[PDB]
A = this chain, B = another copy of it.
Amino acid sequence: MQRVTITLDDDLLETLDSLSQRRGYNNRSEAIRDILRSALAQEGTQGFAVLSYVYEHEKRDLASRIVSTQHHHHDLSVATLHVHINHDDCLEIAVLKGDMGDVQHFADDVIAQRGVRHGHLQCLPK
């Protein structure tokens, strides 16, 4: 086997070590090795996708802007689930379909802007 040495900051190490004692790992090396294993494990043209994001609806009238943006590409949209989590925040999940290339750009149009948080895209190609 081989060895790779990396420099890690204190807080990150405090969090890694926290999970180390608990999770029952001998040390940092073993924990990191497992995390890498899963990360790498978790890695077509047509398919589906799930886009989730959080945003304040009033902010910049963002709600209106996101809906029109989606309507500009409604052909790629199957449907959206919306949950009014609090007085100002909205949680939306858009199920998208079509060309993975166009879906990915459509995703950038929606979440790559101010007022949108926790944006995540999950692709599911056929």
Residues of A within 8 A of B (CB): 1-10, 12-13, 15-16, 19, 28-29, 32-33, 35-40, 43, 48, 50, 52, 54, 57-58, 61, 63-64, 67-68, 70-72, 74, 77-88, 90-91, 93, 95, 118, 120, 122, 124
A111 and B69 CA atoms in complex are apart in Å by 23
22 A–B contact pairs at CB < 8 A?
Answer: A1-B7, A2-B10, A3-B7, A5-B5, A6-B29, A19-B40, A32-B32, A48-B83, A52-B122, A54-B124, A63-B63, A63-B64, A63-B68, A64-B64, A70-B84, A74-B86, A77-B84, A78-B79, A79-B83, A80-B81, A80-B82, A91-B124
CB pair A8–B1 under 8 Å, yes or no, is: yes
Give the number of copies in the complex: 4
Contact of A118 among B6, B7, B122 (CB under 8 A): B122
